[PDB]
Symmetry: C4
Subunit: 388 residues, 4 copies
């Protein structure tokens, strides 16, 4: 086996087609399905799998009570076969913790989980299913990472971490791993003012990450990483099509180098594909809450502070709950280009649906098509009343 | 690995022997068995598996309520080991959608699922477990396909699609795929007047598909495909042994080039093996409803408008519910001929059994023997009262 | 891979050690464990597995009601990992039917299942997981076979079948298969007067089968098969240590060539290892019912009509229910001799425990040791009251 | 494949990081999780797995009643994927019995299970999943072994057994196996006065086992084994940091060659890593009961009868139940040193929590880091009240 190199451009995105959906909450009403949140998708050279943070209980289990909670000793990164639900019997534990990332370099998979109390957390880096390196908290305030897949080039896999405040300046680092070993780390540079939960993808130009500014911004910060030189820059998506949640209404002029103001101390993990005229942005439909999901074709969104949509696709109706979203691609697929993909976390339960005492999710996932395909909408599909 | 070529004739069919049966509804009374419908069987070079459209819920789950419904966002093509039931824990999702086909070409498997609203549906073509091609609706009226396996020759796998009315002229296309890529498509030609849910098999002569005329005909339309030239013809089974359901009583003269009249706007997926004196037709025993199933040896049924049975075998008693039926063969088995096989869907629940609120099925499957074997009958075997 | 040859003698049997136990009924009180009966054990070159006839329902499922029944359309031969219980999720279906045998020839496994009504049953012979040959009933009276593993030599695998009365002369045939194909069959010859449910093992001398005379005999008939010449002989175990159930008390003179009288029209599947001074016989402890199980060292039991035990080992206490027992060996193990093994079916439920409406079993299995090991006893271990 | 050789030293231990945790009791509240106790961890060259003694019932099953019991016919050594819980559907049975050890030699795994009544127990030694050797009780008083992994060097795998009193002098033997065959055994020599449940690890110096003196000592006995010469010595950990439970308070002078007095006829399985200045000891926090767990860096603990801690890490808070603990390492990991690892059994149910009628456990596991990582605590996490 050889390390994968990022040698192709993105395929032209003219629409999105259904890729996967697990209907986990529907099935878990009467099956041993693990409570999860913060899911993602990641491919190996021979298989693509769903990933998420388990809560160490099933949905019907009495221990599902209180699972709105973010960080406990009972969480772990698990993976399971594409479009199956995360069950007790089919889920593989990658590592123990409450914040994660994972990616395959072409030879083996690296998985990283962070665990610990708020003031003493640590990352353990696994490679080929063995622990290889460990990183202690540097700011003693909830060391945390991407919650979706990392990306590798010629064996080098960059990962973005943040340690420090969720509501002010924090200490973000970009780590460069190879075979789970730390090659290098560097402090965040550039104009992004707050960085959390980066969603990344790679192509011949380099690695692009779209992140969450949890402090002042409702535009999304972007980190662009050169995995060969092991350097990066940062800024914001310039477009006035704002893609954080909650967020103000779309103005006519965005901000390239500072947070767009209006909503403080909140946000959601999200993603984009920034590729000139082939640029597509994801966002919740609601500006107030994690509901609905849409894709919008916004040419040169990264660099054009006046850019507006020229095409779109609804993924989840505004009437339905969404949640986290992130990017992944099958780097090992056939063809001359990388097909852009994404997932949307469909959160059910608390805080929005409080007649149940749990919080979980299901997953829907799409990839791009060069066709102009008809659109459907993709709800979680569970009826909360059945759980009462 | 090499692409499979269709180089053999059919084995002589003198009776049918039991091949597989999953007892899914019996077991699902107290196990996490997925609600399904539209099942089939398909072989890989090293394994044969059951396939069906899941409804994204188990039978005992409260979400089984309403599963008479044909098209929802919670359906997916799943496969699972031969004669096991389709469980949450053993089912592999092939793709997402509510109409499907799947076949192995000798090297890898192609699976096709259609999803979307009635007026904006699309097919996604998967090959070696990756999405490769997409096809948008051309008539904006429930794009739909075979609901049983396709067949390949030297890497070319033809698939029959229909888009348009279920009760009048529609737009049927034959697509020719290789490694999931579209080589060619063509509009239906010949004398078949309405085409749905083709059941196909291959042999040295070419590929033969027996379909459902949902409009005016109670005889079955036939499409014969040359996978090398990538051309086809169509007509009806000439025999007065009528094999659609519901249907009129058998006359003494059938129709080769037009629907045999009596029942409009209905039908069921079915199959036949058309092989001169070795011809066998499948049909429900009832002329009114999906109950019972029998095989009838009808020499030259395809071409002889006077042909009647000379031998038969009851598969499912008239007193027991049947449903869809279709053809498959193990193209990778040893020997000098291809052994004809088929499955029968045994539908339980709605609309016929309305004391439960779900609709599901189990599977029975047979293959041919050159012996003259004794016959049994093969009911689903579940007692509906247990589910109340 | 090469066909296995029987080139070794039996290891010296000085005691029996625990080999496997699945505790299926205990676990099935609260897990999705399939109802079974007629279990056995059989080895592949790389794995040994448990086998049994499923009833197509779990124990806790309502369809377990009535499973005392021997022959239904919902039965199948299943296999599952050694000492695990037969669950819905881990059981592999080998073929469909209500009487079976199975064995590996060194290259692939042959499995045979019989299904059908009493007067029209048929065997389907599977090889490398594909149907290869079929055999129709020859006496139209419950065609039936071993219910434990067959044995192969240089690709030839003999199997004993019976068709006809359970209470008078019947038509027994020995079939010789290779790669699932029928090489030859022959009618029973020799002095055995009634043959059912043969338990077989192989060694350099040939294949030895210990069977059940259901008609007049309480001594066990023996068939000795030469798999090279494809011929056989038959007689009874000469020893007055009688090993059928029910049975008279042990006399001082047994019968070599005729049934030992006292109990008619009943019996149980059992086994022995006939090896001169290394001979061990299995039997229920009770003479009246299927309770208890013991092994007895009876030198030259096959040929000496005065032979009595000189050593023994209790396997299951008389106070505990037993059932069928049969032989198997790991022909692919290391060393200079074949280690004798056996299983005992531990039947729970009806007819002996009629407060439940089901009949199932668990399995215990032992292999021989050249040590003189201490003995324990091995009950099923389930408490019937828990199922009420 | 080649036999593994112990060619490296221990990595420098500066802290411990989370390795695995199965949350078995939490999940088993509503899933088919087997009741277990006496768990451990052991690695193959390509996978690391959890091990334990099943009780042949799930936790929610009615047969969980009475599982405080140590030795029954329904126990077996099972293994299952790292950090998954031991379920009916994912657990592999290694052998049948109520005391065990298991280890991989680089080519295949040896597993040993002891079963039988107190006065007639026997060990069966399995190699590459086949029974190879058997050992009868030599003192007729609960033949018993390590309850955690053994260690191999160049194919030789030493195992410590004890037969005889739990409250006075007993007969301890060290057996040396290769491919499951007995090379040699020897009686215990040295100054250890009572030996049970040895926890072992290997490195270039040889194999080191830390055991339980159940008779008079609250310091732990140590056996040091040379697997090449196949010889051993024994003594106690000299340190006044006492690590058995229950135990007296830590004095200022320990005992090298005799039991440290204060608590008789009790103990718990435990472990240590004895490596000069890199020495770390594990122990329960409570001196009275199996609650809490901590690691303490005690330089030269083995040889220095005045040695005290200079660093530590809490693993489980005193308020939470612990239990057995033992050592394992991934001998097949990359790098120049062996990374020390351990597990802690977290016992729930009886005798400490008697509102339920069962006894089970979950597992937490850690490995060493050369970093000085922040510490968390790792409770079982289940709420007993949910089981009422
Ligand atoms: C079968 O399936 C197919 C395939 O899916 C379906 O076809 C799809 O239909 C959907 C729904 O209509 C389309 O999505 C929308 O796309 C438009 C963009 O396209 C329009 O505008 C383009 C740009 O025009 C501008 O520039 C051109 C330069 O050439 C200039 O000519 C023009 O005058 C103007 O200056 C046009 O080019 C384009 O025309 C083309 O396409 C037409 C078909 O769409 C075709 O008919 C034409 O011939 C031509 O080919 C077209 O006019 C997006 O603007 C739109 O997204 C907005 O609206 C949705 C609600 O629907 C909202 O959720 C979005 O967020 C967004 O609107 C918000 O943001 C805006 C930007 O800031 C803001 O301006 C809005 O006020 C609004 O903001 C508010 O809401 C948000 C969200 O809550 C909030 O954050 C803000 O604060 C604020 O409150 C849709 O994405 C697909 O593109 C289309 N696909 C295809 C291939 O056709 C088909 O319908 C299905 N069939 C059936 C029967 O069902
Ligand atoms: C153990 O197992 C074995 C193996 O399974 C069992 O043996 C099987 O038994 C079954 C049941 O009887 C047989 O199935 C039937 O086969 C007949 C066809 O065979 C008969 O007719 C043949 C043709 O005769 C014609 O041509 C010849 C030319 O040579 C000429 O000589 C003759 O005079 C006539 O012109 C005969 O050749 C054949 O004889 C041979 O076989 C005999 C044994 O079967 C043997 O004894 C002979 O010696 C000789 O070897 C034999 O006479 C099918 O016709 C029949 O199917 C019809 O009937 C069933 C109901 O049973 C029905 O469901 C079918 O749909 C069908 O009838 C409908 O359609 C017809 C065609 O349109 C129509 O005419 C009917 O009126 C009827 O239509 C009505 O119902 C349908 C359905 O609801 C509806 O759609 C219509 O609208 C309308 O309302 C059976 O398939 C097996 O062939 C046979 N197998 C073997 C190997 O023997 C055995 O019984 C078991 N043992 C025990 C103890 O149980
Ligand atoms: C720790 O574990 C170890 C290992 O398991 C335990 O040791 C085992 O203990 C068991 C139980 O005692 C033994 O099983 C019994 O074996 C005897 C056979 O051995 C005895 O007889 C031998 C033959 O003697 C004859 O020939 C010799 C020729 O040399 C001659 O010298 C002698 O005088 C006589 O002519 C002796 O050689 C043998 O001695 C040797 O072994 C002794 C230890 O056993 C040792 O002390 C000596 O020094 C010497 O080394 C010994 O005396 C079997 O006969 C017996 O089986 C019968 O009894 C059981 C009930 O216990 C019954 O279930 C059996 O079916 C059978 O009896 C029925 O059938 C008979 C034959 O037809 C019939 O005659 C009986 O009347 C009876 O029939 C009735 O019941 C049946 C069944 O329901 C029914 O069908 C009939 O119709 C009728 O109603 C046991 O198998 C093991 O051999 C022994 N193993 C070892 C290695 O020692 C140890 O106990 C454990 N420790 C503790 C503390 O628990
Ligand atoms: C984020 O995470 C990090 C990483 O985990 C956290 O940092 C960790 O903090 C914990 C908790 O404090 C530490 O564990 C303790 O370690 C001490 C040992 O270190 C102390 O002592 C060292 C030795 O000093 C002696 O020798 C030196 C020679 O140089 C001499 O200079 C000195 O004067 C003295 O003679 C010191 O070297 C060491 O200093 C170093 O480290 C300091 C930080 O720890 C640092 O500040 C310094 O600058 C320097 O670098 C330090 O002073 C252990 O002693 C202790 O374990 C005892 O106490 C715990 C309870 O906390 C108890 O459970 C243990 O069993 C044990 O005490 C029992 O046994 C003793 C021995 O017999 C006995 O003497 C006691 O009385 C007691 O016995 C009683 O209880 C037991 C148990 O029930 C019973 O059996 C008996 O019978 C009896 O009843 C802890 O293990 C970590 O080492 C530390 N890790 C690191 C890397 O710093 C950090 O806190 C987290 N941050 C936040 C904000 O939460
Ligand atoms: C796409 C779709 O809904 N196909 C239908 C099919 C269809 O309604 C008729 O053929 C008419 O066109 O028949 C029905 C049927 O059971 O008769 C099952 C199919 N259900 C599913 N494939 N899911
Ligand atoms: C085909 C069949 O039904 N075989 C029977 C068998 C049989 O009744 C007797 O041997 C008499 O012929 O005995 C019974 C029995 O438990 O005694 C089990 C078998 N049950 C099953 N194999 N399913
Ligand atoms: C064979 C056996 O029963 N071993 C016991 C062990 C034993 O009782 C003591 O060490 C005294 O000898 O301690 C107990 C214990 O939890 O203290 C667990 C073990 N339970 C099991 N291994 N199953
Ligand atoms: Ca924000
Ligand atoms: Ca019709
Ligand atoms: Ca008898
Ligand atoms: Ca002690």
């Amino acid at each position: 086996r050889n390390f994968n190199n990022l040698t192709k451009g993105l395929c032209t995105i003219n629409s999105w087609h259904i890729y996967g959906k697990d209907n986990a909450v529907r099935i878990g009403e009467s099956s041993d399905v693990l409570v999860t949140r913060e899911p993602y998708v990641s491919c190996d050279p021979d298989e693509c799998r769903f990933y998420a943070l388990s809560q160490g209980t099933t949905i019907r289990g009495k221990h599902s009570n209180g699972t709105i909670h973010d960080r406990s000793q009972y969480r772990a990164l698990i993976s399971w076969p594409l479009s199956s639900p995360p069950t007790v019997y089919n889920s593989r534990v990658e590592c123990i913790g409450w914040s994660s990332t994972s990616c395959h370099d072409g030879k083996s998979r690296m998985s990283i989980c962070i665990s610990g109390p708020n003031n003493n957390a640590s990352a353990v880096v696994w490679y080929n299913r063995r622990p290889v390196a460990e990183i202690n908290t540097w700011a003693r305030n909830i060391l945390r990472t991407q919650e979706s897949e990392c990306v590798c080039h010629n064996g080098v896999c960059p990962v973005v971490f943040t340690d420090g405040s969720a509501t002010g300046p924090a200490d973000t680092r970009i780590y460069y791993f190879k075979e789970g070993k730390i090659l290098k780390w560097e402090s965040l540079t550039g104009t992004a003012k707050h960085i959390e939960e980066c969603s990344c993808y790679g192509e011949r130009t380099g690695i692009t990450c779209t992140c969450r500014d949890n402090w002042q911004g409702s535009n999304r910060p972007v980190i662009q990483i050169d995995p060969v030189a092991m350097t990066h820059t940062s800024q914001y998506i310039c477009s006035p099509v704002l893609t954080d949640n909650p967020r103000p209404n779309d103005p006519n002029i965005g901000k390239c180098n500072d947070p767009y103001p209006g909503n403080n101390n909140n946000g959601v993990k999200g993603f984009s594909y920034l590729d000139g005229a082939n640029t597509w942005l994801g966002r919740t439909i609601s500006t107030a809450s994690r509901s609905g999901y849409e894709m919008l074709k916004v040419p040169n969104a990264l660099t054009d502070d006046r850019s507006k949509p020229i095409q779109g696709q609804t993924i989840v109706l505004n009437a339905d709950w969404s949640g986290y979203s992130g990017s992944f691609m099958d780097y090992w697929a056939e063809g001359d280009c990388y097909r852009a993909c994404f997932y949307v976390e469909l959160i059910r339960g608390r805080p929005k649906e409080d007649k149940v005492w749990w919080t979980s999710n299901s997953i829907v996932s799409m990839c791009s098509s060069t066709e102009f395909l008809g659109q459907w909408n993709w709800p979680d599909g569970a009826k909360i009343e059945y759980f009462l």
